[PDB]
Design a protein around this motif. Structure first.
Motif, short mmCIF file in Angstrom:
data_model
loop_
_atom_site.label_atom_id
_atom_site.label_comp_id
_atom_site.label_asym_id
_atom_site.label_seq_id
_atom_site.Cartn_x
_atom_site.Cartn_y
_atom_site.Cartn_z
N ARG A 19 17.83 3.51 3.80
CA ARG A 19 17.10 4.73 4.14
C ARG A 19 15.84 4.89 3.30
O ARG A 19 14.90 5.57 3.70
N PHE A 20 15.84 4.25 2.13
CA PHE A 20 14.71 4.36 1.23
C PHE A 20 13.60 3.35 1.51
O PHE A 20 12.50 3.47 0.97
N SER A 21 13.87 2.38 2.38
CA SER A 21 12.87 1.35 2.70
C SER A 21 11.63 1.93 3.37
O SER A 21 11.64 3.04 3.90
N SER A 46 11.78 -2.61 0.61
CA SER A 46 12.52 -3.35 1.61
C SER A 46 13.89 -3.66 1.03
O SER A 46 14.13 -3.49 -0.17
N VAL A 47 14.80 -4.09 1.90
CA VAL A 47 16.14 -4.47 1.49
C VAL A 47 16.49 -5.65 2.40
O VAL A 47 16.21 -5.61 3.59
N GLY A 51 21.61 -7.14 0.82
CA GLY A 51 21.65 -5.79 0.30
C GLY A 51 20.75 -5.58 -0.90
O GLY A 51 20.70 -4.49 -1.47
N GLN A 52 20.03 -6.62 -1.30
CA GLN A 52 19.16 -6.49 -2.45
C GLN A 52 17.86 -5.78 -2.08
O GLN A 52 17.20 -6.13 -1.09
N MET A 53 17.50 -4.79 -2.88
CA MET A 53 16.28 -4.03 -2.65
C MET A 53 15.14 -4.67 -3.42
O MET A 53 15.34 -5.21 -4.51
N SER A 54 13.95 -4.63 -2.84
CA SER A 54 12.76 -5.19 -3.47
C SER A 54 11.58 -4.34 -3.04
O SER A 54 11.68 -3.52 -2.13
N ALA A 55 10.44 -4.53 -3.70
CA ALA A 55 9.26 -3.77 -3.34
C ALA A 55 7.96 -4.47 -3.71
O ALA A 55 7.95 -5.40 -4.51
N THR A 56 6.88 -4.02 -3.09
CA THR A 56 5.55 -4.53 -3.37
C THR A 56 4.75 -3.25 -3.53
O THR A 56 5.16 -2.19 -3.06
N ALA A 57 3.62 -3.35 -4.21
CA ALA A 57 2.77 -2.19 -4.41
C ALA A 57 1.34 -2.66 -4.55
O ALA A 57 1.08 -3.79 -4.97
N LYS A 58 0.41 -1.79 -4.18
CA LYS A 58 -1.01 -2.06 -4.28
C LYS A 58 -1.70 -0.81 -4.81
O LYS A 58 -1.28 0.31 -4.52
N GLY A 59 -2.76 -1.01 -5.59
CA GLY A 59 -3.50 0.11 -6.15
C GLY A 59 -4.42 -0.33 -7.27
O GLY A 59 -4.45 -1.50 -7.63
N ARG A 60 -5.20 0.61 -7.80
CA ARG A 60 -6.11 0.32 -8.90
C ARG A 60 -5.31 0.21 -10.19
O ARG A 60 -4.54 1.10 -10.53
N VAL A 61 -5.51 -0.89 -10.91
CA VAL A 61 -4.80 -1.11 -12.16
C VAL A 61 -5.78 -1.29 -13.30
O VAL A 61 -6.93 -1.68 -13.09
N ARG A 62 -5.33 -0.99 -14.52
CA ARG A 62 -6.18 -1.14 -15.70
C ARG A 62 -6.13 -2.57 -16.19
O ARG A 62 -5.26 -2.94 -16.98
#
Length: 174
Positions: A19-21, A46-47, A51-62
């Motif tokens: 549900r969190f994906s 994503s999952v 059943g393993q959950m994983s994620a990706t992210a994008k944005g401005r980083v220092r």
């Protein structure tokens, strides 16, 4: 007065990875020492079949002092006895970007509107967190509805971080 011991913090009961994906827009963040993600932070959870959950992210980083760049990050979560508490192994698609392993707790969420994430990288000798960070996510990049907003404020206070967040903007910079 209140309890700021990390061990006392409640987290999402019966957290449901499925549900969190999907996409979560960071609306606010409490920075840890040497903050990395600056703004325009968007996460995709994503999952897999195991059943393993994983994620990706994008944005401005220092990247460097006063030197920012748009970057892609990757995270993989390892379960713990608590369904809402994870170990997050992370790194950027660029080997030279920050990488490591942080606790990743889903403090609260209603899955379709808001989510409150928390991570204590280092504990103080009294149980409180010495170096923490927290993200408030929204399914809608325009912000959370008032009811969700109020619940989040309550959660932020429960984490003893209510006065320490800054808003995260989404202006397409990345």
């Amino acid at each position: 007065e209140r309890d700021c011991r990390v061990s006392s913090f409640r987290v999402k009961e019966n957290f449901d990875k499925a549900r969190f994906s999907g996409t979560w827009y960071a609306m606010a963040k409490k920075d840890p020492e040497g903050l990395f993600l600056q703004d325009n932070i968007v996460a995709e959870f994503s999952v897999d079949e195991t059943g393993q959950m994983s994620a990706t992210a994008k944005g401005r980083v220092r990247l460097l002092n006063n030197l920012d760049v748009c970057a892609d990050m990757v995270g993989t979560f390892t379960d713990t006895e608590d369904p809402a508490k994870f170990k997050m192994k992370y790194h950027g698609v660029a080997s030279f970007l920050q990488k490591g392993n942080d606790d990743h707790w889903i403090v609260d969420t209603d899955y379709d509107t808001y989510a409150v994430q928390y991570s204590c990288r280092l504990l103080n000798l009294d149980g409180t967190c010495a170096d923490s960070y927290s993200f408030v996510f929204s399914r809608d990049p325009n912000g959370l509805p008032p009811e969700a907003q109020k619940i989040v404020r309550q959660r932020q206070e429960e984490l003893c971080l209510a006065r320490q967040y800054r808003l995260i903007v989404h202006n397409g910079y990345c």
